[PDB]
Amino acid sequence: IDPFTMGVITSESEYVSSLSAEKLYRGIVEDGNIIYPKALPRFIEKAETLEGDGGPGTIKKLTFVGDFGSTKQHIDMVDRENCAYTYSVYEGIALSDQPLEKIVFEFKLVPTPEEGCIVKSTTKYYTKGDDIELSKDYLEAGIERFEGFTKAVESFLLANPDYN
Amino acid sequence: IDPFTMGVITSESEYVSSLSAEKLYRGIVEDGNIIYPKALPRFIEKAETLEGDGGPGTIKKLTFVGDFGSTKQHIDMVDRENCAYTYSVYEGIALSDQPLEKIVFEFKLVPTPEEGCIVKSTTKYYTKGDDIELSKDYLEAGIERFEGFTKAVESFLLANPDYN
Ligand SMILES: O=C(O)c1cccc(C(=O)c2ccccc2)c1
Numbered sequence: 001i002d003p004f005t006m007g008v009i010t011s012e013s014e015y016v017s018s019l020s021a022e023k024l025y026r027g028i029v030e031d032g033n034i035i036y037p038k039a040l041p042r043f044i045e046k047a048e049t050l051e052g053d054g055g056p057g058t059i060k061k062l063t064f065v066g067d068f069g070s071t072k073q074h075i076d077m078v079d080r081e082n083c084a085y086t087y088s089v090y091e092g093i094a095l096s097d098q099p100l101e102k103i104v105f106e107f108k109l110v111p112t113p114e115e116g117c118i119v120k121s122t123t124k125y126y127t128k129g130d131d132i133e134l135s136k137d138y139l140e141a142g143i144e145r146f147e148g149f150t151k152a153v154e155s156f157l158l159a160n161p162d163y164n
Numbered sequence: 165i166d167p168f169t170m171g172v173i174t175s176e177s178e179y180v181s182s183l184s185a186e187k188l189y190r191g192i193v194e195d196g197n198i199i200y201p202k203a204l205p206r207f208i209e210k211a212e213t214l215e216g217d218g219g220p221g222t223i224k225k226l227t228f229v230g231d232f233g234s235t236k237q238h239i240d241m242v243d244r245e246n247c248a249y250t251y252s253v254y255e256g257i258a259l260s261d262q263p264l265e266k267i268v269f270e271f272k273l274v275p276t277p278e279e280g281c282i283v284k285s286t287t288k289y290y291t292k293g294d295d296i297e298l299s300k301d302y303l304e305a306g307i308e309r310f311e312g313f314t315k316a317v318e319s320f321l322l323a324n325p326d327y328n
């Protein structure tokens with residue numbers, strides 16, 4: 001009687017990039033503050049880090065083009081060595097007026113013998129126990145926006161190898 | 165495009181038992197084939213072991229009173245020293261036409277100084293990524309029925325200490 005309930009919905013998607021794991025990781029994680037407005041110019045107006053040096057515990061902020069507000073990313077795991085990166089979002093337009101406690105975004109790049117890499121995207125949606133009602137359309141739009149974000153940075157680096 | 169989606173819904177409940185952890189664990193895990201029909205006589209008609217010796221990997225079969233078929237439990241963890249027990253169910257009246265891949269049941273006893281114990285019940289619902297719509301009524305009935313089963317065995321054991 002009167003139990004504790006919580007749901008975790010996990011979505012996974014992969015694709016094969018020709019870009020090396022190190023270069024893609026570097027563009028997304030280390031140089032994202034510079035890359036994002038140039039790689040996603042119709043979405044990201046500005047990318048900055050509010051607190052921290054980039055390691056676990058860092059808070060970055062993407063401010064959107066026009067009048068769409070902003071989103072704060074809470075960096076959780078950072079692993080340059082294995083091209084693994086993880087962060088959480090607790091509020092924002094990523095949540096899209098659904099009953100969510102948080103969203104975790106996970107990203108892992110695996111080298112391929114051709115010096116490409118496999119891009120592994122994961123989203124985890126955390127829901128309280130009164131309302132476990134998430135649209136199958138909504139769930140896959142989130143992973144699709146996230147993986148598409150990666151593809152846009154991949155597109156940018158492929159076209160601009162020498163962006164300093 | 166086309167991601168793999170999967171949800172895990174977890175429900176937890178605790179209550180304090182008057183039986184000692186050793187006696188309750190032995191009655192529930194080790195002696196269930198004898199205890200279950202005597203402790204839930206309007207529900208369990210027969211409890212048997214299909215495969216295994218009782219350790220991890222064992223398949224038990226409960227036959228229910230009346231026209232409710234049976235349920236197969238696949239034992240995962242058995243740990244007498246820490247009074248921990250885990251099994252999975254893949255089909256049967258426990259599932260009751262909900263869109264489910266499996267249910268994992270965890271049973272864990274924590275000794276208390278009053279030489280009773282804390283009874284820790286957990287149900288985990290695994291659902292595919294096409295629907296992800298589970299009734300909170302359904303979920304809390306399941307943990308309530310699961311915790312309630314333990315209580316009934318506790319009453320039976322307290323009432324029949326010398327059941328061998
Ligand atoms: O979920 C149920 O209602 C249910 C039905 C029939 C048997 C069991 C069971 O074997 C068990 C095992 C350990 C602890 C409590 C219960 C549970």
